[PDB]
Amino acid sequence: TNTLPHVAFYISVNRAISDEECTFNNSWLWKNEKGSRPFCKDANISLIYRVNLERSLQYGIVGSAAPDAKIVRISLDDDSTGAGIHLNDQLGYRQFGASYTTLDAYFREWSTDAIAQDYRFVFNASNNKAQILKTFPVDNINEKFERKEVSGFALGVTGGVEKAKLEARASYTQSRWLTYNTQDYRIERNAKNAQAVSFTWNRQQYATAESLLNRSTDALWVNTYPVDVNRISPLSYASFVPKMDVIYKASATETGSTDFIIDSSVNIRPIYNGAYKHYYVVGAHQFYHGFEDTPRRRITKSASFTVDWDHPVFTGGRPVNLQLASFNNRCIQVDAQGRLAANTCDSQQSAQSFIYDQLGRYVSASNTKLCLDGEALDALQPCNQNLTQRWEWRKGTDELTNVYSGESLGHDKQTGELGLYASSNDAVSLRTITAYTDVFNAQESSPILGYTQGKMNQQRVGQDHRLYVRAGAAIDALGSASDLLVGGNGGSLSSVDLSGVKSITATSGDFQYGGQQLVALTFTYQDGRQQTVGSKAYVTNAHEDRFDLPAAAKITQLKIWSDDWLVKGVQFDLN
Amino acid sequence: TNTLPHVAFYISVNRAISDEECTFNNSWLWKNEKGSRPFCKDANISLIYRVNLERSLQYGIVGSAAPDAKIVRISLDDDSTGAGIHLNDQLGYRQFGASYTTLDAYFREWSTDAIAQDYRFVFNASNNKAQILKTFPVDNINEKFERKEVSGFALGVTGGVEKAKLEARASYTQSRWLTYNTQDYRIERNAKNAQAVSFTWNRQQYATAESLLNRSTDALWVNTYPVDVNRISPLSYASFVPKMDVIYKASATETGSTDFIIDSSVNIRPIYNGAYKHYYVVGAHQFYHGFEDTPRRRITKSASFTVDWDHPVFTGGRPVNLQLASFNNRCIQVDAQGRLAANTCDSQQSAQSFIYDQLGRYVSASNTKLCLDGEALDALQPCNQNLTQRWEWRKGTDELTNVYSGESLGHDKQTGELGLYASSNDAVSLRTITAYTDVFNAQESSPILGYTQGKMNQQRVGQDHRLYVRAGAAIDALGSASDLLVGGNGGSLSSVDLSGVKSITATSGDFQYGGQQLVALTFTYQDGRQQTVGSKAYVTNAHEDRFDLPAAAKITQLKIWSDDWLVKGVQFDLN
Amino acid sequence: TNTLPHVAFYISVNRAISDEECTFNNSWLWKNEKGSRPFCKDANISLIYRVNLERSLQYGIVGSAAPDAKIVRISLDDDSTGAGIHLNDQLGYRQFGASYTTLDAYFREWSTDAIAQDYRFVFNASNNKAQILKTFPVDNINEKFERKEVSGFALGVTGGVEKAKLEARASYTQSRWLTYNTQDYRIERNAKNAQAVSFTWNRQQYATAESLLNRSTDALWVNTYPVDVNRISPLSYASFVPKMDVIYKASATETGSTDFIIDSSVNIRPIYNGAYKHYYVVGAHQFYHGFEDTPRRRITKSASFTVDWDHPVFTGGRPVNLQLASFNNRCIQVDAQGRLAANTCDSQQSAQSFIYDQLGRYVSASNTKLCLDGEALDALQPCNQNLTQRWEWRKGTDELTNVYSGESLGHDKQTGELGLYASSNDAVSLRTITAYTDVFNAQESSPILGYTQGKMNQQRVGQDHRLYVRAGAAIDALGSASDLLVGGNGGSLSSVDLSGVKSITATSGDFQYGGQQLVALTFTYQDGRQQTVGSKAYVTNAHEDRFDLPAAAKITQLKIWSDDWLVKGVQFDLN
């Protein structure tokens, strides 16, 4: 109870990878022909993050070393990593012999499995009320060096007989040595601005295909596969797990709402290595050359969570309730207005939680300035250092009195109305107990459909407890009203009502007609009926995610990632 | 009592290795002739795992740093390793001189003992309710480097006399140095997906037979055995012991059942090194060349354990019972329905265990929401923060009272019926004591017959307390009903009854008539009678495992590893 | 309560960077032609500092190891860094082929992105009452060395036959080896004087463009881009975060005011690398040469905070108040003169705070010599060791008595007038309680408009609760009076009144008509009206900062950075 409260909850990311999404050309000089095939087997992405929410100092403590602030913590370290990210198990390759004319040109192609060029993790903040405080990879590594200077001379004399000869050798020399060390996948932090920080694990050694060669050339006849795999670490292709922390600083006493967006991604690149029939004086030897122009395809996934700066997590002290002991289940519930009511108790009721301070007062978690005073118990007042605000717990008893008069706090038998009385009467009881309660559980995580890019649009759910869709072959705009449709305008409006829908089936991907956006929205009721809007035939690289709710759930507001032309992503802010 | 409970139990793997299973061809170019022989002596596999089951936080504690979760721990580290895995003691070899025509071809063969190519350990989860949280070999090793650049020049002058000469030497030089370190058996973790993680210890240096040569060639007559053994570590062939941890994360409050499958394996590869009669200008010299096309044979074994997410292990607190002290042996036993009965006490009775909380209530391990309240003691209710639910232990006494009224909890002399009374009467007693009891012992481990591969079929035991077999020369399908036979269908159905069978003799192996599957099922009763179904004559590489039970045991359900064509493995879920 | 008080508060710096400010010539030999373009994308600067204020020893403690002093602490370390400073994400470049005559001259230009030449952080003190005590980068790094001396000889004899020859070789050699290590961005502290210390992270290796070459030359035809990026660390261009501490020492018991000025900056330099058509005997080869004459542009930003040496932070003990318990809200408030009054209590009232000492006295935070004595309670006196000055807290009571007589301190019911009485009467009450209060919060930070350079002018706000402006096309002088206008004099005077202005819009930058100074002052009221003075058309590289206040705020004094010719910076000292 004396320690520092925190809030933690695991947030998961899972994303099946289709073999189709891993399909690219079987050659580079011959990309037009030779067809296609999948470049990886059973690719999968599955990481688990750690989330912590804490204030920097206990409530009431003044002038400690740590400045008062609000902290959001996102960590991936030894105690929590997840499963990893996977692309393959082996290293497949095939031969491609010369088909066109062979006079002086490229005539052989060796395509292999794809090694991840770089893993990218990008964080972001919805607005600027958040700040970046600490980053565990404190910054790019500053590498020591070793420079070595060597200067010398040679003085030699030689005498010989055959004929007799005598000569003296005199020489000077100079050389400078430079050396350093380099990580294979070196950390590279990128701080775009004060509200978004991005990490990047990137190749430094053996980065290009050119460095995978163990041979320069051969004779005009040798046919062997020299693209080594012993120089390729299984870290690169088989599996990998990250390690990084980013921690967010917020304003001192700011009240509002904010969204943080975690995006994890992996970049995939096949390797295309060929030989040119260099006909030099030595002969038509096959010097080998890598193809760095080979395309790279980015695969991403997202997750989100909404933090409320008014949440009792940031008060800095474990809250308590007040069970009115005259009844079996009654507690002092306070509205936002200020009045109070005795109702059923709940361990998750923020409007019921309270804080005990150094000055013997009581503070509700609704606002730090909301405090209980005795001159008029009916409602709470903006509080100060009044003597009537201080309360004392008499030892070994259940009578919480005050300091101004010493009279105990008591409540009525039938209505529980609370007042100050010196001694209990027939119709007024004094007993009152309390205990710490969990007001620290996390709100349910709501996954994202589509692609969290572009400016985010925040609009509340409309009058019909649903939204409006302006869609055609491709989605154009979303919103809770006709004018509130952010994005395109070519799609016809549809006023859908969703009060009583079990789930939504949304199919996204590289929409062939246009862009790479979720276009298909199939809504699944409790019975299982389906209503689909969008084009499920003109879609390529389709990825689908399922989004479930309890039936008859009143959605609160919406999140719409979008550019100035179309909707890029959609999120349902649930209860 | 104040510490964090855990559950631990050793799970063992043992597997005799036949010399027949270690038989391969005596040559590679001459594999057809020269017969066969065993490639290892007295091979054996024996490892011991460590199993831990624990929740992340004590029950009732709120908002600590560690998020609430469910953890399954599998470890192989310093404190528990087992015996090891063995393949040989020495390094046998024999000469094979030229037999065919010797003009220009391979003419000598030197076959030796087999060194384990790689040790593979694969874990798996039955369903997706489990997740991968931490892996002790945090990931593939990222190796530092040392790149060194050297550029220099030479300026020299030489004067001589014979005749007089004077010359000046001028030269430039450039060189780049690269170096790194490499483990012999480097760790290589492979994360197939979010529910299964696989480790692999694999050769990096001296991996191929080509690297075992200490000589390039000799004259046209030298006959010596150069395949060195000093470059082969006894780690590789003599003995080995693993070190690795994998730990499983489960959902917050998920209820159900799940199976984890441990598979340990060793891959065996003989080495075939020969010489080609390269007739160059120097002569017919015997350059040596390794044979990497030599087959590798995988040998495996399995073990399993079934965890119950409802087990009192995951409550997070040491349970207690309530011995009704009026009788010598009576405790408050609660059914799944909610009613209670006073019966014989048992230290292993989950339906008898209870939990003491911060709020002075009592929670049964059957469900965290099942709590005892005083308004109607006859059955438990879905509990909340009611005052009538809180109980206090009066100091130095045996009368557990309540807080709502202060009356003690008492029970009747003849039936033990419990009620709330202010003072004990002639027919009602008040004394009640308690103590912590071991409800943490593990369920008996049930080994596996066959090969745990393919999708796993979970079907309950049929009406006759047994299963049905559709078998012929080779097993086709298993199940508890004719329609519930998963796998093939060519075998005739057999309705076997097994209530009162001591043991089952199941002979598996590389079934020559088809596949590598358990086909022979010999059932051994208490007297020792045998009933065999399957082909014991068309089986090769036969491995048998014995499975024992107490007589007259009612098996509960079945586990059937299988592909879409046949049964791959069978498991009996016992009492 | 027993620990050492400190005061902390985050001070932030943010500065948007225009793409225009990052525009320089597209060539160096051809700078006149080929136009211009932006040299960086979305550049941004955002760091967060840590501020601590503490005395070296608890109040009253005598003769400890640590000398009595006053300390101001500014730190950037692991626990607080901010976001970073950014210049780009990639490394853009373009080819520039020969356009003029190509006989013997430079004929190719390769301009690239700009890498920060050096990061500079400069601190300063307004006056000399501050001193520099400790610097965490204790000083420039003193680098170890390794000098190696090698001397040897060669004595060889060779005999041969063709003819027979016999010769003997005799030689001596000498060489000395020198080596050391060098940081890429080596710390370089610069202590200008006793009141200002400046840090500088500067390039040592790969500092000049000449060192970025991976090739000396090529043939007369080769066209390739050799300006490597693998030798350029992403630390240099992508992102960076500092680490440094500077801590300020002040006089023992000096009273006054002082200003510290934090300035963070980044220097930007593009790279211009070309080739000369060196026509030697080998041929017209293109030796490459860097251009170190390329201009560098300094970009800065500032922030400030004003410390008051009389602030209760430097007393060295947590203060307390005295709530007169007869009323609900009354405390003993003391004026600067010495008299007292009972008024409303406030936790931030320095004139209300008090200190408890070893000698049982009470000291007000207004002055360490101001103490309470009992012979005449009406006002405080310069205090000494008098017995009448010592007060004792009777155990378990609320009656603070004295030691001289033992009579308690009491106050009247209606006016609260305090006196010494042995026993309480009807009209005099004795109860008195106290508690620690936060008198440690920081004053609101007031950002700076312009450029904090030159001598700083400190003038109080004039009679009209505003200032006077002497401005024309460019600002000339500022002040609170016609004669108090420090700077130029060509601008006409303007007497602006500002009591009731919400905000001020001030647009600064490289003023084309003259200098680089804020010239445009647009004043924004609560309604939003604008009154602009200055030239918004003759301004280049314009940077604007917005400065907000609550309406009707009485500004106290001014800060005017300026040289002997014009105003360089302006600051409004708020309430």
UniProtKB/TrEMBL annotation, chains A, B, C:
An individual GO BP term: cytolysis in another organism
Domain Ricin B lectin: 318-433
Keywords per UniProt: Signal
GO cellular component: extracellular region
Superkingdom: Bacteria
Protein name (record): Cytolysin VCC
Parent-record interval covered: 161 to 741 of 741
